């Protein structure tokens, strides 16, 4: 309780800018039903064996993916709690959408079964697990550290896959997948932005050194996935350029938290 | 332990269609505070008596917890249930914003801007019922009081917000009953009564001793009856029998 966010009639609003972001969340409310998948199987069938493997897998990883309930309890400002309550909900809309997309492109139930049991095995899930239990759950962890981890989960992890799905939009393919990709990644941006806003109200925040360790570690994990394990070559993208994008994204985040760049990586993707 | 408390990778194909249908119903009743127009209430408020202002402000003060759903939501494993609870969390935030706006609209003077204690102190199944009780028994008499204001044609912002909020609590309370059905081990009829009947006592004391509905022209004996009626309706919903046998006295609460 040295911290304004942490210390124990919502109106009038004390924090207009926390509140403005809640209001932006509400403004952009949607449901998985809103998204039209009727024109997708034709485009899907035009994809090649390697591109279907890739798309079906990154979807499964999106689906495989509860720290927000913890922040909502911990943070004591009503304005913030409203934003986290909306975040809980919209995340559940994300899951529905991924389930819908899979069910639309993987029609046979046993194929879905093979697919998911594979994905539980894989490194990307274990590595992201180990990272969160290292930087969130450790309980030598601090609140400032968790805020930075929180921001990374939203803005570094899956950043490369949103980009991959945007690359397909460039080629006029799969309008339901790409349209839902836009809504979801927009939602993540806002969530990443909110975490960066909270970080600005901290009395005790972590060393630039420490902020780099959390962030650059996620970059390690995300780059490995999309270049080593499930390479973007599978859908005609360049690996080197993707590693660079992940770093541009991570540099942007460091600067949002008020620190200097580490990688100096420019954005390689016009379409982004 | 229990199906609702035990362990999914992908929502579809839906497993508990009845719980899912409730989530979809919640989604279909989405609203925000700004959709309720409070710009004709102050003139009405200024025409009220001293005792009507007293009553309305005080119930609005007690209207102004979903810590508990941030616990149910974490404990329940069935994805369809977790979806409903997510949406419930959102809607109670809409409710609080609504009640803050109302207070702010009528009690413009900052300086001006009990029952509380009895609620505070007051197995998964027990918590479900106590949870159902909060939605259903607590504040049911306050909902009826504002439906009385509507019958006299007063305070249209308050009364409309009340219709919306009442409807949500109905759904939220119904949902706690659907959860209760799915329990394999549930407390006996004896425990439910204790929880529901303690609830009724607290609510009855509140709207007839501390802050009598007589202040807005209502009959207390009848308000006591209606609270008992709501409690009865809950007991039967949870799969038990009535304890009070109370008829709903209010013709205006019949739609
Ligand atoms: Fe998110
Ligand atoms: Fe409720």
Curated annotation (Swiss-Prot), chain A:
Keyword Iron: yes
EC code(s) of this entry: 1.17.4.1
Cellular component per GO, a single term: cytosol
Effect of residue 242 to I: In MTDPS8A; without tubulopathy
Positions that bind Fe cation 2: 91, 154, 188, 191
Effect the entry attributes to changing residue 75 to L: In colorectal adenocarcinomas cell line; loss of ribonucleotide reductase activity
Active site location: 98
Tissue: Widely expressed at a high level in skeletal muscle and at a weak level in thymus. Expressed in epithelial dysplasias and squamous cell carcinoma.
Reaction(s) the record says it catalyses: a 2'-deoxyribonucleoside 5'-diphosphate + [thioredoxin]-disulfide + H2O = a ribonucleoside 5'-diphosphate + [thioredoxin]-dithiol
Inducing or repressing factors: In response to DNA damage in a wild-type p53/TP53-dependent manner.
Record has DNA damage as a keyword: yes
Gene Ontology biological-process annotations: 2'-deoxyribonucleotide biosynthetic process; deoxyribonucleoside triphosphate metabolic process; deoxyribonucleotide biosynthetic process; DNA repair; DNA synthesis involved in DNA repair; kidney development; mitochondrial DNA replication; negative regulation of intrinsic apoptotic signaling pathway by p53 class mediator
Keywords tagged on the record: Cytoplasm, Deafness, Deoxyribonucleotide synthesis, Disease variant, DNA damage, DNA repair, Iron, Metal-binding, Neuropathy, Nucleus, Oxidoreductase, Primary mitochondrial disease, Progressive external ophthalmoplegia
Any GO MF annotation of the entry: metal ion binding
Subunit structure: Heterotetramer with large (RRM1) subunit. Interacts with p53/TP53. Interacts with RRM1 in response to DNA damage.
Disease involvement: Mitochondrial DNA depletion syndrome 8A: A disorder due to mitochondrial dysfunction characterized by various combinations of neonatal hypotonia, neurological deterioration, respiratory distress, lactic acidosis, and renal tubulopathy. Mitochondrial DNA depletion syndrome 8B: A disease due to mitochondrial dysfunction and characterized by ophthalmoplegia, ptosis, gastrointestinal dysmotility, cachexia, peripheral neuropathy.
UniProt function note: Plays a pivotal role in cell survival by repairing damaged DNA in a p53/TP53-dependent manner. Supplies deoxyribonucleotides for DNA repair in cells arrested at G1 or G2. Contains an iron-tyrosyl free radical center required for catalysis. Forms an active ribonucleotide reductase (RNR) complex with RRM1 which is expressed both in resting and proliferating cells in response to DNA damage.
Family: Belongs to the ribonucleoside diphosphate reductase small chain family.
Protein name, as recorded: Ribonucleoside-diphosphate reductase subunit M2 B
Species: Homo sapiens (Human)
Span covered, complete protein: 30 to 312 of 351
């Amino acid at each position: 309780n040295e911290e304004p966010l942490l210390r124990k009639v919502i109106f009038p609003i004390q924090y207009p800018d926390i509140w403005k972001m809640y209001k932006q969340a509400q403004a952009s409310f949607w449901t998985a039903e809103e998204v039209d998948l009727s024109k997708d199987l034709p485009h899907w069938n035009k994809l090649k064996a390697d591109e279907k493997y890739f798309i079906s897998h990154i979807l499964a990883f999106f689906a495989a993916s509860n720290l927000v309930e913890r922040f909502s309890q911990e943070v004591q400002v009503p304005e913030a709690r409203c934003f986290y309550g909306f975040q809980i909900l919209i995340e559940n809309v994300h899951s529905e959408m991924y389930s819908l997309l899979i069910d639309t492109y993987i029609r046979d139930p046993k194929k879905r079964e093979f697919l998911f049991n594979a994905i539980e095995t894989m490194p990307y899930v274990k590595k992201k697990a180990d990272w969160a239990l290292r930087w969130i759950a450790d309980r030598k962890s601090t609140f400032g550290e968790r805020v930075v981890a929180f921001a990374a989960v939203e803005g570094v992890f899956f950043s490369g896959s949103f980009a991959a799905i945007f690359w397909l939009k460039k080629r006029g393919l799969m309008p339901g997948l790409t349209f839902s990709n836009e809504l979801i990644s927009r939602d993540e941006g806002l969530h990443c932005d909110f975490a960066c806003l909270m970080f600005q109200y901290l009395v005790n925040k972590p060393s630039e050194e420490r902020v780099r360790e959390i962030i650059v570690d996620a970059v390690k994990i995300e780059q490995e996935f999309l270049t080593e394990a499930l390479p973007v070559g599978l859908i005609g993208m360049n690996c080197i350029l993707m590693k660079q994008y992940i770093e541009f994204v991570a540099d942007r985040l460091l600067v949002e938290l008020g620190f200097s760049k580490v990688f100096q990586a420019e954005n390689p993707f016009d379409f982004m």
